[PDB]
Amino acid sequence: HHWGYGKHNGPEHWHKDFPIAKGERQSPVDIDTHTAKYDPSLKPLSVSYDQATSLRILNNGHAFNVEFDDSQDKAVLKGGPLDGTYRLIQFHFHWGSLDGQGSEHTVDKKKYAAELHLVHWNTKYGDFGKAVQQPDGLAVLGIFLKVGSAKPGLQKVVDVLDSIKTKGKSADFTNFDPRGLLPESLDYWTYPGSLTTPPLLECVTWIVLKEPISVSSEQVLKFRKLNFNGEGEPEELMVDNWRPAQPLKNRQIKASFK
């Protein structure tokens, strides 16, 4: 049946419907810090989220998306390894059933409790749908979450989860500022890759931040309370919605720092 993260429709089976699964620029990967190349030609990232307009939060049955108004250049990313302006469309997370797993990307084989993805599309392509068809169509900023101290800026999100418990549900989610989810440092790793869910198109320039943010145990606990299923269907907790690391193949990971 359709794809998911269960035993019968999980990452190991995706290739059957999406052959690109075994492609050459598949994501996520393990970041080997000793093999990453410092590239001093990379510029510092430019994050302009002060005009961000969040609109809604939805449970799509695979994660929860907070969506933004992308009809104009309100929340954009530029600089780093990018050419042009990338507009924020939505953010979502990947997490685990236990605190020692959940991230998609790994650092020297280390798994984090969750991974945040801020999704941006290249404005030269006019819409998100056209951007996914290009090798430079998307820019995703990935941020790792580790369990420690609560992140104040994440509570507004945690609190609305009850209202979007099952697949298909949505809730108005206005005035959320994504600046509350960034670490102090903007040092990063970058490589060419793909979406981590079907259709797994190879259109992403990944921007993975070196510094994780901390969340509290009780914060991540609330994530694990969501459901994959739709209302009135038998309950399947939304946990472990992460794809394992894929072969790097012919790619170089560059670092913005030494």
Binding residues, as ranges, are 92, 94, 117, 196-197
Binding residues for substrate: 196-197
- As measured in angstroms, the least distance from the Cβ of 232 to Zn ion is 27
Residue 62 is among the residues annotated as catalytic for this protein:
yes
Binding residues for Zn(2+): 92, 94, 117
What's the full length of the chain, in residues?
258
Strands (E), the chain: 30-31, 37-38, 45-48, 54-59, 64-68, 76-79, 86-95, 106-107, 114-122, 138-147, 170-172, 188-193, 204-209, 213-215, 254-255
- Specify the stretch interacting with Zn ion by CB under 5 A; choose among 33-41, 113-121, 145-153, 173-181: 113-121
Other Cβ atoms closer than 10 A to 124? 14
Closest CA to 129 of 89, 157, 93: 89
Collect all residues with Cβ–Cβ distance below 8 Å to 94 and sequence separation of at least 6: 63, 102, 103, 104, 114, 115, 117, 196, 241, 242
Identify which of residues 95 and 176 has a Cβ nearer to Zn ion in the complex: 95
Residue whose Cβ sits closest to Zn ion? 117
117 binds Zn ion (CB under 5 A): yes
Identify which of residues 31 and 126 has a Cβ nearer to Zn ion in the complex: 31
Identify which of residues 111 and 117 has a Cβ nearer to Zn ion in the complex: 117
- As measured in angstroms, the least distance from the Cβ of 92 to Zn ion is 6
- Specify the stretch interacting with Zn ion by CB under 5 A; choose among 20-28, 109-117, 178-186, 199-207: 109-117
Residues acting as catalytic residues:
62
Chain residues that interact with Zn ion, rule: CB under 5 A: 117
